[PDB]
Structure 1
Amino acid sequence: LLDVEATLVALRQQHLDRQCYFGVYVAEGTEDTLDVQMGRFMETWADMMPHHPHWVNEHLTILQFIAPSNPRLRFELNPAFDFFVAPGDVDLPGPQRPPEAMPTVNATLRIINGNIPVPLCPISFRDCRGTQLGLGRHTMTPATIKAVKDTFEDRAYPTIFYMLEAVIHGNERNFCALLRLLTQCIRGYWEQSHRVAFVNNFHMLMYITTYLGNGELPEVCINIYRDLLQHVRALRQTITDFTIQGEGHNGETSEALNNILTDDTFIAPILWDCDALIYRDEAARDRLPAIRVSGRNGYQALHFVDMAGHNFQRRDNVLIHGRPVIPITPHHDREWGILSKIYYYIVIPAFSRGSCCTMGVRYDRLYPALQAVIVPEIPADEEAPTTPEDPRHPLHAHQLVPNSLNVYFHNAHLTVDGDALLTLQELMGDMAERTTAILVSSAPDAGAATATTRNMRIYDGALYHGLIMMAYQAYDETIATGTFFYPVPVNPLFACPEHLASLRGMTNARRVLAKMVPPIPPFLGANHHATIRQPVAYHVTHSKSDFNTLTYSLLGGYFKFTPISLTHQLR
């Protein structure tokens, strides 16, 4: 199945000319923050597209794909490989601009069986396989389904939640300290529209279930969170069930030998602590790994950062938010990563349906905004007011001044006391410098690692201290567009054709150009070299069957296509 040397030779023999090497080229970072690189990528990818890509038209039926007019027909030879054309005599990654060279034929590997083009593997078959997988497994209740659907589809999500999650950056010493404000804000947001909040970050709902899991919240939101967690656990259990146990090669055992969601070499799209990188480098240790963190190769992890010395401008420095209880140590356990991968790659796409995006934050602009508190002095031997109608309350007009935090909270229409707002000063202990990008690369797994596939290499990008926005709206003039966030999406799945309006210097030409092809910078990964590819994105954005069935079909599609994983699946 992996003797493609002769076929590649024969393809290179014949003369073929082609241009538009956008989705096949990978670059590196020039140590800018995110924005100069984003603008440069915008201008380049605008003026460097001579023709249209051939991997984007996946709407064709089987008849059209078979018809001899199909240009990409001659390259569909092996079901486990992808034959494309790329500029030859170049090394990946390389410079920022692709040097001019003669185009040659290159062939990557289809790691996932779901990467097969939709014209060959239809959507109805995937949905039927998913409903065959989910025979009697755990399902979700229509109440929770409707609630999370409304939360995902709502455009009135207050930016105060994004700001709070950003300043928390996923740390227990922050969560447990701000627990007083969080329960109040959650209950207030819920008892206005019957909607559950804080579904962006994975490291929020487990904290909710573990801490506020005794009756602080009403019996409904805790039940919704428990249902979501139970669905994730049932998915993981199914991954365990549908493979044979009792064998493991030099690398990982049957589990990540068969699937990807249980693989440590794979990383989540959002990183908050550096334990995943430790797990990644310590898991494989055989396939030659490489990490690019904004320039120099190799990351430098350090403990918590004080308030005085923050150094918003830095290079090759990653935080871990100290420790809740000298070398670095992993924060959480190993299955935490598996749960995060399952969540982010199944439940978020199945509900957002290609509407969510991922963006970066600006702490240099966020922190000066949150240091405006106008909580009033309480008289001695007196009680604090609870309702905001009296002037003593922080949410009163007597204490409402422009460009403060109380105006933010009033625009959000919430009710908070004083100690919760005061806890922000203790939150100011730990800090967040900036969000950054990571480009990891490794050889194929030992299941399909032969004498020629080792030369092939996979490339995927990820964000550190990033953000996931559900539904961006450019019709909110209460806050300037791009005041704290800027889109930097790197995925065929998490792409956002509309969130780009928040980026500075956007034209109608760029808008309609990005409306067709998903904008991904080359220094963050190419489509033909990444793991998740366009077929799965098209499937998740065009399939309309259900939510449970969609999740199970995506799970079934997330499977390897190696001659070893086949020994598990066929058995």
Structure 2
Amino acid sequence: HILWVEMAQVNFRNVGGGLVHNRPVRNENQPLHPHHDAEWSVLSKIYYYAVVPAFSRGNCCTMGVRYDRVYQLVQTMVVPETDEEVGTDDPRHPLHPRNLVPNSLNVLFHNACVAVDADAMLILQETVTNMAERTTPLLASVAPDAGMATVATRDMRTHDGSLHHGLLMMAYQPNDATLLEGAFFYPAPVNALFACADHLGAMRDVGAEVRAAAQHVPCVPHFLGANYYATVRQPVAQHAAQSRADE
């Protein structure tokens, strides 16, 4: 259990076993206490197992992210020196084409046709005070509880994993070249529900045959629990994908 980290010691390449508490709390900063009530995780589980597959219908995918390059991009911003904010009409505004240099971060905000002010743009400087090293797989191992607690079930334990500091993207956009395909997110499917097939194409150096044989089988890796040792087998994932019930 490690606490907040700064630009001082980030060490993206760390591969050890250690997870971060992002500025552990709001106020306290005392040793080793969780900063949310128990039912919080229950509501999270409800949301991710009961409402997401209701709307997505087997499209989402848990994605492993490249925390080095996202930070390498949030830093390079382009803003001039003005006392007062004037608006997007003025050639000093950070969204006007003149001060839009190539491969900056402002060009991305223009790719989405969103409208922002230079102040909120500069606000992004706060993020370097609590980093996020990497995304890592986990692997739980629990035994059956007091219900299925027969002598002949003492060792029939389960195996399920999850991502720490991961990210779930909704629908893959393969047909754009405004960015590299596997730029910031590499596919890391954790469960049979959150495992599409178009996201494997985002992974650099994809095989000529794996993608052909990737539609009819969920591509969950064999270091994140298989379909038989997990608490959420395939039939429930198949259910949410081939029914039509007014969402």
What TM bracket, shorter-length normalisation?
A: over 0.9
Q: What is the SS of the residue equivalent to 1:462?
A: strand
TM-score, normalization: structure 2?
A: 0.95
Letter of the structure 1 residue corresponding to residue 82 of structure 2: I
Q: Output the CA distance in 1 between the equivalents of 2:209 and 2:106.
A: 40
2:234: which partner in 1? Answer: 534
Q: Per-residue CA shift, 1:206-243, capped at 9, x if unaligned?
A: xxxxxxxxxxxxxxxxxxxxxxxxxxxxxxxxxxxxxx
Is the radius of gyration larger for structure 1 or structure 2? 1
Q: Does 1:425 align with 2:129?
A: no
> Which of residues 22, 26, 31 in structure 2 aligns to 1:324?
26
Unaligned runs of 5+ in 2: none
Q: Output the CA distance in 2 between the equivalents of 1:513 and 1:421.
A: 44
More helix by share: 1
Report the alpha carbon displacement of residue 546 of structure 1 after superposing the two structures with TM: 1.4
1:484: which partner in 2? Answer: 184
Report the alpha carbon displacement of residue 522 of structure 1 after superposing the two structures with TM: 1.1
Letter of the structure 2 residue corresponding to residue 319 of structure 1: V
Q: Output the CA distance in 2 between the equivalents of 1:452 and 1:375.
A: 68
> Which of residues 53, 73, 83 in structure 2 aligns to 1:369?
73
Q: Per-residue CA shift, 1:367-417, capped at 9, x if unaligned?
A: 1111111111014xxx3112x221011101121100111111111111111
> Which of residues 78, 89, 98 in structure 2 aligns to 1:389?
89
Q: What is the SS of the residue equivalent to 1:389?
A: coil
- TM alignment of 1:448-459, pairs within 5 A: 448-459=148-159
2:207: which partner in 1? Answer: 507
- TM alignment of 1:515-530, pairs within 5 A: 515-530=215-230
Q: What is the SS of the residue equivalent to 1:511?
A: coil
Percent identity (aligned): 56
> Which of residues 35, 39, 49 in structure 2 aligns to 1:335?
39
Q: Output the CA distance in 1 between the equivalents of 2:155 and 2:161.
A: 20
Q: How many residues align?
A: 243
Letter of the structure 1 residue corresponding to residue 20 of structure 2: L
Moved beyond 3 Å, runs of 4+: none
Q: Per-residue CA shift, 1:120-175, capped at 9, x if unaligned?
A: xxxxxxxxxxxxxxxxxxxxxxxxxxxxxxxxxxxxxxxxxxxxxxxxxxxxxxxx
Q: Output the CA distance in 2 between the equivalents of 1:536 and 1:427.
A: 39
2:198: which partner in 1? Answer: 498
Q: Output the CA distance in 2 between the equivalents of 1:466 and 1:452.
A: 37
Q: Output the CA distance in 1 between the equivalents of 2:245 and 2:5.
A: 48
Q: What is the SS of the residue equivalent to 2:177?
A: coil
Letter of the structure 1 residue corresponding to residue 177 of structure 2: E
Q: Output the CA distance in 1 between the equivalents of 2:144 and 2:66.
A: 36
Q: Output the CA distance in 1 between the equivalents of 2:149 and 2:164.
A: 30
Q: Does 1:313 align with 2:13?
A: yes
Q: What is the SS of the residue equivalent to 1:358?
A: strand
> Which of residues 321, 340, 344 in structure 1 aligns to 2:48?
344
Q: Output the CA distance in 2 between the equivalents of 1:506 and 1:333.
A: 42
Report the alpha carbon displacement of residue 508 of structure 1 after superposing the two structures with TM: 3.6
Unaligned runs of 5+ in 1: 1-300, 548-571
Report the alpha carbon displacement of residue 427 of structure 1 after superposing the two structures with TM: 2.0
Q: Output the CA distance in 1 between the equivalents of 2:143 and 2:105.
A: 49
